[PDB]
PDB file of C-alpha atoms in Angstrom:
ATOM      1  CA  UNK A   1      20.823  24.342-154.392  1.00 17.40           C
ATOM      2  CA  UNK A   2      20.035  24.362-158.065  1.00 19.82           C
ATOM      3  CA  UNK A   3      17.074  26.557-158.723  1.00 20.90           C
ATOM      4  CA  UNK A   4      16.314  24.035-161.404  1.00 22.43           C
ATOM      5  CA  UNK A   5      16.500  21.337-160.449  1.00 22.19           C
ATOM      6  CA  UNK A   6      13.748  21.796-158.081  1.00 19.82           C
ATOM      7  CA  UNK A   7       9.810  20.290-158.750  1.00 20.14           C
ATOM      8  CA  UNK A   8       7.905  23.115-158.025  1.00 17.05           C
ATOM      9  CA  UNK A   9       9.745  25.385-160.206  1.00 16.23           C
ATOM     10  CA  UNK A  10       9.824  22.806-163.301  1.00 13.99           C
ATOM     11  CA  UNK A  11       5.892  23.260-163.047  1.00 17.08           C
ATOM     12  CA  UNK A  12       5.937  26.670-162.728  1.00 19.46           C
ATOM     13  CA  UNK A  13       8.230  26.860-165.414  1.00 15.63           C
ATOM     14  CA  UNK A  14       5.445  25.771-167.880  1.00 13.08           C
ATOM     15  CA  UNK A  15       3.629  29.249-167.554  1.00 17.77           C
ATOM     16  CA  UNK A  16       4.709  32.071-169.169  1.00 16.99           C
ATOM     17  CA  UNK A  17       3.935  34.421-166.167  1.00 18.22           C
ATOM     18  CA  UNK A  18       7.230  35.269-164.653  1.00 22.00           C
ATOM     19  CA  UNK A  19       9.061  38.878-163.833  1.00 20.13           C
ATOM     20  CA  UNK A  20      11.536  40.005-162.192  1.00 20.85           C
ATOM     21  CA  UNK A  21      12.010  42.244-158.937  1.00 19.49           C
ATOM     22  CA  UNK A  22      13.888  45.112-157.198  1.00 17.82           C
ATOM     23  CA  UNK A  23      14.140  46.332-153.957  1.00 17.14           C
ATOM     24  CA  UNK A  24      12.620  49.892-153.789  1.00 21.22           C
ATOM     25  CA  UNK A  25      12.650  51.590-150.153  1.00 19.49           C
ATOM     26  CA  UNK A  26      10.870  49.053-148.505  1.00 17.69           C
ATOM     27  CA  UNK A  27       8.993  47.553-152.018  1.00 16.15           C
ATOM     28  CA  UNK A  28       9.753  45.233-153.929  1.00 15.10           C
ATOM     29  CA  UNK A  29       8.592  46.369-157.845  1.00 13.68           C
ATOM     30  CA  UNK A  30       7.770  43.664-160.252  1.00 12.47           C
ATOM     31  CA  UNK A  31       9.622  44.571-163.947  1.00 15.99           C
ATOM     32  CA  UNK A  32       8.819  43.657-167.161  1.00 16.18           C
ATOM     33  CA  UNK A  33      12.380  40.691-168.169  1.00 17.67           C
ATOM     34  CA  UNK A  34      12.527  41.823-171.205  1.00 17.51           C
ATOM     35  CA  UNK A  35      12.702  45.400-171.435  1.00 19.09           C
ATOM     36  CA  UNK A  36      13.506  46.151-167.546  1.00 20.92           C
ATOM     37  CA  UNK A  37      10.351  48.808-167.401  1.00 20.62           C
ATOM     38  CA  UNK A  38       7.990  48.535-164.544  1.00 20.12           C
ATOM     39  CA  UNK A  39       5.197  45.528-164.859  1.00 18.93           C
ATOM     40  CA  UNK A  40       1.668  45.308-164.790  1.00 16.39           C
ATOM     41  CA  UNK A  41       0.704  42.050-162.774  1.00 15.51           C
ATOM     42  CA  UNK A  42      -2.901  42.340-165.139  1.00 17.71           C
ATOM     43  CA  UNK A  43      -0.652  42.452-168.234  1.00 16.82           C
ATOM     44  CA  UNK A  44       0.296  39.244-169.641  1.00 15.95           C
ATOM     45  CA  UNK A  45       2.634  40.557-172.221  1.00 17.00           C
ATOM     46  CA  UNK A  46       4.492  42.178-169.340  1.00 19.61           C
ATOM     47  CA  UNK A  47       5.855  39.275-168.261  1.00 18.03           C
ATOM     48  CA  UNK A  48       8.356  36.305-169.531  1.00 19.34           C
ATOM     49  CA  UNK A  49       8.962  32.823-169.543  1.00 20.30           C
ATOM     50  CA  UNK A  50      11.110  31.986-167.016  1.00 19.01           C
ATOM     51  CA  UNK A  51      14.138  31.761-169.415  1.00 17.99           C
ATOM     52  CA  UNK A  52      13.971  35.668-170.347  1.00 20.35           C
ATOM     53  CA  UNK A  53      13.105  36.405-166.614  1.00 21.51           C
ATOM     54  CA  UNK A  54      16.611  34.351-165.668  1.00 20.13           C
ATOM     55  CA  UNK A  55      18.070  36.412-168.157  1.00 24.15           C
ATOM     56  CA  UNK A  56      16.619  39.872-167.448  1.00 25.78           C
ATOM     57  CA  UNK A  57      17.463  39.425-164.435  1.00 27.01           C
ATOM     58  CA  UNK A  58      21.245  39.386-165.137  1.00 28.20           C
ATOM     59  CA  UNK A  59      20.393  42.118-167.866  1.00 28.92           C
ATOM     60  CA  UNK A  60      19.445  44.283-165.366  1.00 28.25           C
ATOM     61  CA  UNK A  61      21.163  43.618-162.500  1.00 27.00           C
ATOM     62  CA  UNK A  62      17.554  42.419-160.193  1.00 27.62           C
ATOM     63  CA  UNK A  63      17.290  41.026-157.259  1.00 26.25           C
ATOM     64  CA  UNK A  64      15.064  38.075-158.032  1.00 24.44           C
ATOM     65  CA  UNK A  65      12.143  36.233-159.698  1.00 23.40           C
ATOM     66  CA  UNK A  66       8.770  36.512-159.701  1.00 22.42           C
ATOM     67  CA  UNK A  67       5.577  34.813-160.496  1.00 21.56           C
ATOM     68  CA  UNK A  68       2.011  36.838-161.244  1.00 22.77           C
ATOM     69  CA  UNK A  69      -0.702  34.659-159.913  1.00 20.83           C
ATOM     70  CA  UNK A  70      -3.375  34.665-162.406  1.00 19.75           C
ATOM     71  CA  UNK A  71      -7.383  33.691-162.001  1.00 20.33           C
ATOM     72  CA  UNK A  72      -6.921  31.145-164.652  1.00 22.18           C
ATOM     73  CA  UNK A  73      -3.917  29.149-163.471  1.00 21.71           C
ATOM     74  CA  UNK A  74      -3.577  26.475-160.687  1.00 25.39           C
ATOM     75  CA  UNK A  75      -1.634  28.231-158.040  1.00 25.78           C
ATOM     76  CA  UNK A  76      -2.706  29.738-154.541  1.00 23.70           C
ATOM     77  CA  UNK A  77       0.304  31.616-153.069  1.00 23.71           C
ATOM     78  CA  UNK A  78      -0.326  31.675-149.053  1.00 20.48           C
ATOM     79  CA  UNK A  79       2.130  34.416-147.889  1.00 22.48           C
ATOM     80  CA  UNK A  80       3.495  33.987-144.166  1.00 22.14           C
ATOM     81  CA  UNK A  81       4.895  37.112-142.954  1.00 23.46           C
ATOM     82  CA  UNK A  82       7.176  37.337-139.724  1.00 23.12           C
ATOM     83  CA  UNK A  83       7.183  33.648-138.704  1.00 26.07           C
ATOM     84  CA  UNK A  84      10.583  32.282-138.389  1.00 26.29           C
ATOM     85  CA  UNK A  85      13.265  32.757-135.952  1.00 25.20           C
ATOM     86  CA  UNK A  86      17.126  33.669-136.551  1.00 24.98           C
ATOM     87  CA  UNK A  87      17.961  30.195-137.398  1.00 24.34           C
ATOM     88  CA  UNK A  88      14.754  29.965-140.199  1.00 25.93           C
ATOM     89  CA  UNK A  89      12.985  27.596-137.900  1.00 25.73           C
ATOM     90  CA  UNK A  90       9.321  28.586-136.945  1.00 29.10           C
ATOM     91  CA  UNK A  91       8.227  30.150-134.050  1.00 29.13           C
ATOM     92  CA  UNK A  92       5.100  31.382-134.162  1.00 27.07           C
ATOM     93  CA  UNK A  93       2.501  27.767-133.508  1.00 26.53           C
ATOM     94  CA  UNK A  94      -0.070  29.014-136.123  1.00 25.48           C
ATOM     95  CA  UNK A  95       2.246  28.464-138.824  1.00 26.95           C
ATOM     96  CA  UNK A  96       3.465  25.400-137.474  1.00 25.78           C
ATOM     97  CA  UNK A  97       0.066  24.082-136.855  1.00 24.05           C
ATOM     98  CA  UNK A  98      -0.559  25.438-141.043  1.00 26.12           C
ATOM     99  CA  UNK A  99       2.914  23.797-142.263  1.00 26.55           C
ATOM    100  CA  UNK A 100       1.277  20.393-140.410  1.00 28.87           C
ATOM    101  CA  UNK A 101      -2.450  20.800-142.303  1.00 31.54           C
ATOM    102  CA  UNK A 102      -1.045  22.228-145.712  1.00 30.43           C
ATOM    103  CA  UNK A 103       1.892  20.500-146.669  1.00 30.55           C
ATOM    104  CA  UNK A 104       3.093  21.746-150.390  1.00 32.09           C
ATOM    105  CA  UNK A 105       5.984  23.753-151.688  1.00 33.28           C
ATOM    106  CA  UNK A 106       7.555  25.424-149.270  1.00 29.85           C
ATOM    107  CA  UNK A 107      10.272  28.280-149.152  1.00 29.56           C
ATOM    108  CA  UNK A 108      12.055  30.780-147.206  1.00 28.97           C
ATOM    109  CA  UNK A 109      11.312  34.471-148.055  1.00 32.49           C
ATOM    110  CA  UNK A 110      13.747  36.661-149.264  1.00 33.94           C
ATOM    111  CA  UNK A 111      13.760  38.809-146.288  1.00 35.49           C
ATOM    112  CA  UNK A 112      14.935  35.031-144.656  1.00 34.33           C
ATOM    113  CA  UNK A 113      11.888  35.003-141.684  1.00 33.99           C
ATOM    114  CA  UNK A 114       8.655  34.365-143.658  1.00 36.56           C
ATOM    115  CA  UNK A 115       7.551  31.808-145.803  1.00 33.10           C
ATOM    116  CA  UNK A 116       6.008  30.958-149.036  1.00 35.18           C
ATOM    117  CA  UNK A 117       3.856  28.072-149.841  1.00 35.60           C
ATOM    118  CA  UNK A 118       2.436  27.011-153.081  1.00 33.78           C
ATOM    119  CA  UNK A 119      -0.366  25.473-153.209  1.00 31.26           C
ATOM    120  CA  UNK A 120      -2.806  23.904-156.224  1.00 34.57           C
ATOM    121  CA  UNK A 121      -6.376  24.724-154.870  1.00 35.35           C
ATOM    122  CA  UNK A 122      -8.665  27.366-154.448  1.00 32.68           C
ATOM    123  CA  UNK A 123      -9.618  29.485-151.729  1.00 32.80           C
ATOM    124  CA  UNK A 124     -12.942  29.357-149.055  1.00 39.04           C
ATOM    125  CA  UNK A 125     -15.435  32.252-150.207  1.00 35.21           C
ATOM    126  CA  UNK A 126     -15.071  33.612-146.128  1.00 38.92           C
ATOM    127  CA  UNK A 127     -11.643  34.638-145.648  1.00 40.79           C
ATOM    128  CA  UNK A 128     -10.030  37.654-145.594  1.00 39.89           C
ATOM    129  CA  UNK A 129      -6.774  37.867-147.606  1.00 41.29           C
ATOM    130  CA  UNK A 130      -4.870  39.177-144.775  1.00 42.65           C
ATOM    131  CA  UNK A 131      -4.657  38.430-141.221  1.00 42.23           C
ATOM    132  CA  UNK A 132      -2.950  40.109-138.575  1.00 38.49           C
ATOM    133  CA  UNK A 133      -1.192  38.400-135.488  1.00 41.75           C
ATOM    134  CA  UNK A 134      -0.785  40.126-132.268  1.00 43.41           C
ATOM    135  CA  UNK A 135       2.912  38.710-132.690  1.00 45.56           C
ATOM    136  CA  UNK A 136       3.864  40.543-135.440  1.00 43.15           C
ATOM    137  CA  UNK A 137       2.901  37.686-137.913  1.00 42.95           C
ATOM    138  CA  UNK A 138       0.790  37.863-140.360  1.00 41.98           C
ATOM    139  CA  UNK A 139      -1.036  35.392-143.182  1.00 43.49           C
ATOM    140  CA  UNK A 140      -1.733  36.842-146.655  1.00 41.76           C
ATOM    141  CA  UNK A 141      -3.509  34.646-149.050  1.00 43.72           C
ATOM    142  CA  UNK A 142      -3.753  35.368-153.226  1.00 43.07           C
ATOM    143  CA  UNK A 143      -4.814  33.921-156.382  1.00 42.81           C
ATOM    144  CA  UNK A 144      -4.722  36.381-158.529  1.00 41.90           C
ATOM    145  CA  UNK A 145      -3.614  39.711-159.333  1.00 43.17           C
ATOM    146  CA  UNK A 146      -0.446  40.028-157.702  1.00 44.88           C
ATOM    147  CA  UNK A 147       3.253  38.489-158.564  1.00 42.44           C
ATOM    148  CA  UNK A 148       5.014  36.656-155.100  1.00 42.72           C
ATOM    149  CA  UNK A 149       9.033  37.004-155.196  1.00 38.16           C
ATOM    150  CA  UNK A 150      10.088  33.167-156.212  1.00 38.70           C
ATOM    151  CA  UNK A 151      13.712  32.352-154.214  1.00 39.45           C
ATOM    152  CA  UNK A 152      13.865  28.783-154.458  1.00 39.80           C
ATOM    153  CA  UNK A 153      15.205  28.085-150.951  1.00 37.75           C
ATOM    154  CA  UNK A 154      12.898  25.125-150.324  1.00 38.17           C
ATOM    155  CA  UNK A 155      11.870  24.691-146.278  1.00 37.27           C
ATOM    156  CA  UNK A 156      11.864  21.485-144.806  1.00 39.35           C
ATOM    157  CA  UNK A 157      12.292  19.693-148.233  1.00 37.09           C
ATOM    158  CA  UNK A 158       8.825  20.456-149.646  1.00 41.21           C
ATOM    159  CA  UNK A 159       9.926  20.684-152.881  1.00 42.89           C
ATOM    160  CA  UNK A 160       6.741  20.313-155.199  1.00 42.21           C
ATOM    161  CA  UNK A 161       3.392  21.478-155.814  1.00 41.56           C
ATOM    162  CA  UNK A 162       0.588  19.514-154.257  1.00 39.79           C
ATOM    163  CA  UNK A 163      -3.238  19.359-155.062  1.00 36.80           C
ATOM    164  CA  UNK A 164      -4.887  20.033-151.613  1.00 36.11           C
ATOM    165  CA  UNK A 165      -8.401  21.509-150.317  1.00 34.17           C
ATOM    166  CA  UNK A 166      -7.732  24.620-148.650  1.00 35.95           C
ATOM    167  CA  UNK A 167     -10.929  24.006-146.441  1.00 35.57           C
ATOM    168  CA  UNK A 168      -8.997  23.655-143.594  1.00 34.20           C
ATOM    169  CA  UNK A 169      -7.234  27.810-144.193  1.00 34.12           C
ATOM    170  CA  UNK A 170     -10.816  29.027-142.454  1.00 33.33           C
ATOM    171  CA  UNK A 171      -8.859  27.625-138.965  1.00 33.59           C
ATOM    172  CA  UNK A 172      -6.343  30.435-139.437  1.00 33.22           C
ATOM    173  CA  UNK A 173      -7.127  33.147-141.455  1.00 35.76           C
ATOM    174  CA  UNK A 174     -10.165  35.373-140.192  1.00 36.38           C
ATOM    175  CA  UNK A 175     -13.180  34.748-141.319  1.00 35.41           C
ATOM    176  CA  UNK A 176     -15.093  37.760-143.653  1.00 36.72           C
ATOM    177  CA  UNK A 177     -18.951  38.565-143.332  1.00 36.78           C
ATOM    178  CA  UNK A 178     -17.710  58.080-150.420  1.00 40.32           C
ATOM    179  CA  UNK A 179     -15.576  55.151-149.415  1.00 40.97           C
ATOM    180  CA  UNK A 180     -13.397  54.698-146.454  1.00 39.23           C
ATOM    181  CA  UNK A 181      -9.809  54.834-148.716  1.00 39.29           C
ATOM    182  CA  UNK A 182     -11.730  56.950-150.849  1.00 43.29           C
ATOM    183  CA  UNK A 183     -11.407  59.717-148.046  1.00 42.66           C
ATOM    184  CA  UNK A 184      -8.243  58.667-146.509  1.00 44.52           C
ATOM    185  CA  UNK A 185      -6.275  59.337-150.319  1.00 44.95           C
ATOM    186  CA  UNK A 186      -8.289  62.607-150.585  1.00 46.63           C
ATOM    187  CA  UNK A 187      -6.803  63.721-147.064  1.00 45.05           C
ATOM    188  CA  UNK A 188      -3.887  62.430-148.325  1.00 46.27           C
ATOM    189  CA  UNK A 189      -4.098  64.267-151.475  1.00 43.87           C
ATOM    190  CA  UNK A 190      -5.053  67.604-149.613  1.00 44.26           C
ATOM    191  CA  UNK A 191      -2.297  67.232-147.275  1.00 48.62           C
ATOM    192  CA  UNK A 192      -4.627  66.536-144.085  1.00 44.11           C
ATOM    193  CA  UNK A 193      -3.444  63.652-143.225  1.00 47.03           C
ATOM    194  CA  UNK A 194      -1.220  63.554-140.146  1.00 46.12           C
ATOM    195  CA  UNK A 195       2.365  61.967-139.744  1.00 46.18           C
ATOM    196  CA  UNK A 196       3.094  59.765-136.764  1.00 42.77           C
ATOM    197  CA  UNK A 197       3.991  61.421-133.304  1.00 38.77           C
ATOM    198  CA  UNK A 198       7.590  62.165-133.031  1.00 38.82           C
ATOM    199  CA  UNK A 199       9.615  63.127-129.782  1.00 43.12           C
ATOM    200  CA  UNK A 200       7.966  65.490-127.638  1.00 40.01           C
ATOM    201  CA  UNK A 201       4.818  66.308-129.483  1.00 43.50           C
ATOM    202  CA  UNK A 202       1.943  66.540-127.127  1.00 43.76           C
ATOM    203  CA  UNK A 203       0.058  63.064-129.019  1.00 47.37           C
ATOM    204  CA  UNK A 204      -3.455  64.113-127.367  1.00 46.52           C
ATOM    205  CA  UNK A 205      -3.392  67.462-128.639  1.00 46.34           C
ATOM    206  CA  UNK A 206      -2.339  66.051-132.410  1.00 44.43           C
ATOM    207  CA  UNK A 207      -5.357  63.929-131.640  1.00 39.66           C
ATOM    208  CA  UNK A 208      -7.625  66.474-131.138  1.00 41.31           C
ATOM    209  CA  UNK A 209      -6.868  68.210-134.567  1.00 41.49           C
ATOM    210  CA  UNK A 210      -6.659  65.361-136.699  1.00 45.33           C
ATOM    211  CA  UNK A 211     -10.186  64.626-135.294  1.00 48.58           C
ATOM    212  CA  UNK A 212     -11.176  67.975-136.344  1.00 53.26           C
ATOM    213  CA  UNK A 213      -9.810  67.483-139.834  1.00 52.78           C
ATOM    214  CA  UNK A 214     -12.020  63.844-139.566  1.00 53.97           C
ATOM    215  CA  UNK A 215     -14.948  65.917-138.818  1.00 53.29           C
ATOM    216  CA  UNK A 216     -14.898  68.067-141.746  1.00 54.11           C
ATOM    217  CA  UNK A 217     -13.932  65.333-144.138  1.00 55.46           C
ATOM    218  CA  UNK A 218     -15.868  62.701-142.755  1.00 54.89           C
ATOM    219  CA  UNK A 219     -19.302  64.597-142.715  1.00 51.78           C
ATOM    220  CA  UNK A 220     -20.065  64.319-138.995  1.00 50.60           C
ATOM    221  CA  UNK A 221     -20.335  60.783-139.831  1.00 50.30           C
ATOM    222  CA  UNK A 222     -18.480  59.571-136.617  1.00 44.29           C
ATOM    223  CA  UNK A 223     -18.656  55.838-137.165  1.00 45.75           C
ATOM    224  CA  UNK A 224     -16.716  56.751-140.206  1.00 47.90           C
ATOM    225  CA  UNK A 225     -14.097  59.371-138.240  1.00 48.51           C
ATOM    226  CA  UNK A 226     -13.625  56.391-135.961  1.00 46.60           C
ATOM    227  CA  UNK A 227     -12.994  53.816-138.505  1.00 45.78           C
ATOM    228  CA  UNK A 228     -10.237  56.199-140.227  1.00 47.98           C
ATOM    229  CA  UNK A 229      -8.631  57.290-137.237  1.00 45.94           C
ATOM    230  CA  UNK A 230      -7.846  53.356-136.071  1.00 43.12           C
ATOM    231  CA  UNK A 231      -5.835  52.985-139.468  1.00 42.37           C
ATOM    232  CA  UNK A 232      -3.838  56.538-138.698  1.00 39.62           C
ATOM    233  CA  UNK A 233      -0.601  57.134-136.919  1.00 39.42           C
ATOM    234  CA  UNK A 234      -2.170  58.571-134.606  1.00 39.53           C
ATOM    235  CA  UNK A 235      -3.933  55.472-133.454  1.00 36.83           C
ATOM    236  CA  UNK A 236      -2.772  53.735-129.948  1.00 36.72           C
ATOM    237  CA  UNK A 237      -4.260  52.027-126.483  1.00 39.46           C
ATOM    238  CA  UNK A 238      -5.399  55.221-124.956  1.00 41.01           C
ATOM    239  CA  UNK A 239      -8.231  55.479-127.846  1.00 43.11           C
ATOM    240  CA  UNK A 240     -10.013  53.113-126.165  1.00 45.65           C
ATOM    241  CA  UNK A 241      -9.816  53.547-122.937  1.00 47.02           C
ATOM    242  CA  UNK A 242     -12.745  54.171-120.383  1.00 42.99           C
ATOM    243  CA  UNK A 243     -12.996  57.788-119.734  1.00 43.93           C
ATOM    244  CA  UNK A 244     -15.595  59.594-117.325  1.00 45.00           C
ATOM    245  CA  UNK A 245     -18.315  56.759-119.420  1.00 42.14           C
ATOM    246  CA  UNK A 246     -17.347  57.098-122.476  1.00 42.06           C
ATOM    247  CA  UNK A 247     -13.420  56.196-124.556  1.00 43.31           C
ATOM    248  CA  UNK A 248     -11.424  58.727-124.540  1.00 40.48           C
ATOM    249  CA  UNK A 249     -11.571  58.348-128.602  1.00 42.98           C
ATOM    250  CA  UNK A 250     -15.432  59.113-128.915  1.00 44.88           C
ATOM    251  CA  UNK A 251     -15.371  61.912-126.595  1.00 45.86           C
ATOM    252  CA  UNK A 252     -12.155  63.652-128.602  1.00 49.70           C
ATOM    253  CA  UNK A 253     -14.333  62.914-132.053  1.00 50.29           C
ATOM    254  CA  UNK A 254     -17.903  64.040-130.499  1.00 52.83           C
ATOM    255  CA  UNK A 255     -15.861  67.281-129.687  1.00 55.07           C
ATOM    256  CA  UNK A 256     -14.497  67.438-133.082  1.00 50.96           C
ATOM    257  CA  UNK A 257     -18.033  67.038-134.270  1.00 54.31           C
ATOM    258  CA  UNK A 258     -18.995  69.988-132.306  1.00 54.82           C
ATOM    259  CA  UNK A 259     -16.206  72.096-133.148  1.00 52.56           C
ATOM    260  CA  UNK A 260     -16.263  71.783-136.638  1.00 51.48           C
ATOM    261  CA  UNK A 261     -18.564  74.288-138.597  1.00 51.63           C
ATOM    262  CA  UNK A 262     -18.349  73.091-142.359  1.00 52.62           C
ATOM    263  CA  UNK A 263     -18.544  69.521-143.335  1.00 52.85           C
ATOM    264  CA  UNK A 264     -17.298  68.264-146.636  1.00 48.97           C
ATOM    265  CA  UNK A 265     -20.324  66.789-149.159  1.00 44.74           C
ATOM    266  CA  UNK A 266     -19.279  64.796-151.975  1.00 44.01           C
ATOM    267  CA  UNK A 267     -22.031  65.583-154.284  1.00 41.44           C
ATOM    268  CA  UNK A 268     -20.542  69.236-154.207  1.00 41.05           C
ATOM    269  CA  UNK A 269     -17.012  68.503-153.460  1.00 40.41           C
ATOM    270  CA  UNK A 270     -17.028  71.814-151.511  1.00 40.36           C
ATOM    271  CA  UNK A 271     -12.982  71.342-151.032  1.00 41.97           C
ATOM    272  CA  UNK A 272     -12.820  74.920-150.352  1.00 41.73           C
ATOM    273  CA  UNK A 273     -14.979  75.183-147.663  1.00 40.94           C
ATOM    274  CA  UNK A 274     -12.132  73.178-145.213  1.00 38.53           C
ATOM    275  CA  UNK A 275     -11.609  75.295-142.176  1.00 37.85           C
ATOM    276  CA  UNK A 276      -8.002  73.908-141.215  1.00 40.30           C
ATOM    277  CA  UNK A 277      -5.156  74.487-143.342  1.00 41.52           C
ATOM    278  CA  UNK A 278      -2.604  71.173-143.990  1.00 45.81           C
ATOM    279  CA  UNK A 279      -0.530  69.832-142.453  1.00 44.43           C
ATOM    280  CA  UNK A 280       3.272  70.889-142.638  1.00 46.14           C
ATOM    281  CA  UNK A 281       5.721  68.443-144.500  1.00 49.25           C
TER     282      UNK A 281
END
C-alpha cells in the first residue's frame, strides 16, 4: 500500500530521474516537478528526485509519477499493453508465459489492464521495440529515451528489481532484420492525408483518391504508396484480397499510378505542382 515502502521504488529512488504526469486526451505528458512546465525525457535538469516529483505532484495537482529511462542507468522498462482481464488477472498466455521467464518488479498500469515490469538488463540487438498482438495486446520494450508512468501497485508481489538476461525476450517480441514518416507528416502537413471512413462514405471510392494523392507524393514509387497506405485509416481486409489476379490494393494504386500526371521530387520540392486539392477538415 505504501508507495515507499516498496523495494523497487527505494532503488529507483536513488536516481534523480523522476517527473511527473497528466492525462492529455488520450496522452499522458511528462512535466518538469519543479516548475510544472512540460519535460524533455533527454533533459536531465528537467526532471527531480523523487522527493520534488512527490511534491510537484501535489503542487500541481498530477496524476502520477514518472521515471525517464536513461542509456546510462540499469533499468529496462518492458511495457505490456492490453493484457489483463477485469479482475487484473492475465489473459492473454504470452504474457503469462513472459511473467513465468522474466520474473522482476511487477505492476499494474494506470489504465488498470497492462503491466509494467522492471527489469536490470539490457536488451537483444534483434528486437523490435514494439510488437503487435492480433488480440489487441501489445509488448513495448525501452531503455532509454522515454519516461514510463510509475504507480506502485505491485502484481503478484514482485516487489523488487532483479538482475536477469533478457535473452529469452527474442521468444516474444518480433525479431528485426525521402523517408516513409518523412512523407506521411508532409501529407499531413499539406492536408492530404485522409481521415478514417465514417457512416455512409463509399470506403472504395475514398480509396481510390487517397491512392491518387499516394501517387503524386510517393513518386510512382508503389512499393512505397503501398507501405503508407497499410498505416492509413483507410487500411482494412479488402486491400488484400485476390481480385481478377491481382489484390484489389495493387490494382487501385497501379490505377493511381496511371492517373496521376505530376509526381512530387524532393530534390525540387515541386509542392505546387499537386494536382488534388486537400482534404476538408
Amino acid at each position: 500500500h505504501m508507495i515507499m515502502e516498496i523495494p523497487a521504488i527505494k532503488a529507483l529512488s536513488r536516481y534523480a530521474q523522476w517527473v511527473i504526469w497528466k492525462k492529455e486526451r488520450d496522452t499522458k505528458i511528462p512535466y518538469n516537478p519543479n516548475n510544472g512546465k512540460k519535460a524533455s525525457s533527454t533533459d536531465p535538469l528537467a526532471w527531480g528526485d523523487i522527493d520534488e516529483a512527490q511534491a510537484g505532484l501535489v503542487r500541481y495537482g498530477a496524476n502520477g509519477l514518472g521515471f525517464v529511462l536513461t542509456k546510462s542507468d540499469p533499468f529496462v522498462f518492458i511495457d505490456l499493453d492490453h493484457v489483463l482481464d477485469e479482475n487484473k488477472r492475465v489473459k492473454c498466455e504470452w504474457a503469462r508465459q513472459l511473467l513465468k521467464e522474466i520474473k522482476s518488479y511487477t505492476e499494474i498500469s494506470p489504465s488498470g489492464d497492462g503491466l509494467h515490469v522492471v527489469v536490470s538488463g539490457k536488451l537483444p540487438d534483434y528486437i523490435k521495440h514494439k510488437t503487435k498482438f492480433d488480440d489487441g495486446s501489445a509488448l513495448e520494450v525501452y531503455e532509454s529515451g522515454r519516461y514510463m508512468t510509475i504507480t506502485g501497485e505491485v502484481f503478484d508481489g514482485r516487489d523488487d528489481i532483479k538482475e536477469l538476461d533478457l535473452s529469452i525476450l527474442g521468444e516474444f517480441a518480433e525479431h528485426k532484420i525521402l523517408d516513409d514518416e518523412a512523407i506521411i507528416d508532409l501529407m499531413k502537413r499539406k492536408g492530404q492525408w485522409p481521415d478514417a471512413p465514417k457512416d455512409g462514405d463509399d470506403w472504395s471510392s475514398l480509396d481510390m483518391s487517397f491512392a491518387n494523392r499516394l501517387a503524386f507524393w510517393c513518386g510512382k514509387d508503389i512499393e512505397r504508396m503501398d507501405r503508407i497506405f497499410r498505416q492509413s485509416p483507410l487500411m482494412r481486409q479488402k486491400w488484400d484480397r485476390p481480385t481478377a489476379g491481382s489484390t484489389y490494393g495493387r490494382i487501385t494504386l497501379k490505377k493511381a499510378c496511371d492517373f496521376v500526371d505530376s509526381v512530387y521530387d524532393p530534390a525540387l520540392r515541386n509542392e505546387s505542382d499537386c494536382p488534388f486539392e486537400p482534404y476538408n477538415e
